[PDB]
Amino acid sequence: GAMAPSYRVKRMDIAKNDEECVVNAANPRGLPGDGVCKAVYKKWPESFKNSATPVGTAKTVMCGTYPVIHAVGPNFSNYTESEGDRELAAAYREVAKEVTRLGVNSVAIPLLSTGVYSGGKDRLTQSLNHLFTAMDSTDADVVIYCRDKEWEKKISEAIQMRT
């Protein structure tokens, strides 16, 4: 584990991360997709061999020795707010189990269900709080990746408020 486990946020492409493993914001069919998923497919295409997995789950596939944890958040266009909230929390719990199993000291993670699966709503706080609920009990350094300047400031404020 990390000597003093921390949370950090960076505004840049997660395909350029400096962590020991990455979480993909995957679709259930293992397809190249859009946004984070398409960047992950371009950087680690080998990790999409048999990466299909249901909503609310995570499945890790190695690209060489680098682990790609494919985590499938719900598409809020298809789920109700109640059921989608439950599946989004579940996908993050599965990411925490995989990060622990892998024994890594750091992990790069995006906010699941905040892009094209958001159903047109701002889900920064919802998604980040489910991330904290799952990852708080792990000892890996967590680096959250985002692309929007206002989201970077809000995620950074939420991290600092708890310290």
Closest by CA to 36, choosing from 100, 106, 113, is: 113
Binding site for Cl ion (CB under 5 A): 12-13, 115, 117, 146-148, 151
Tell whether residue 27 is among the known ligand binding residues: yes
- Determine if residue 116 is labeled as part of a ligand binding site: yes
Unique residue bearing structure tokens 């990852």: 135
Q: Is 13 annotated as a binding residue?
A: yes
Distance from C-alpha of 11 to C-alpha of 63, rounded to nearest angstrom: 24
Nearer to Cl ion, 79 or 151 (CB): 151
Minimum distance, C-beta of residue 55 to Cl ion, in the bound complex (Å): 12
State whether residue 58 is helix, strand or coil: strand
Please state, in angstroms and as integers, the Cα–Cα distance from residue 58 to each residue in 20, 24, 90, 131, following that order.
Answer: 17, 9, 9, 13
Which residue is nearest to Cl ion, using beta carbons? Answer: 115
How many CA atoms within 13 Å lie on the side-chain side of 18?
5
Residue with Cβ nearer Cl ion (2 or 12): 12
CB of 99 to Cl ion, least distance (A): 20
Please indicate if the annotation marks 103 as binding a ligand. no
Q: Which is nearer to Cl ion, 5 or 115 (CB)?
A: 115
User: Which residue ranges are tagged as binding site for ADP-D-ribose?
Assistant: 13, 27, 35, 115-117
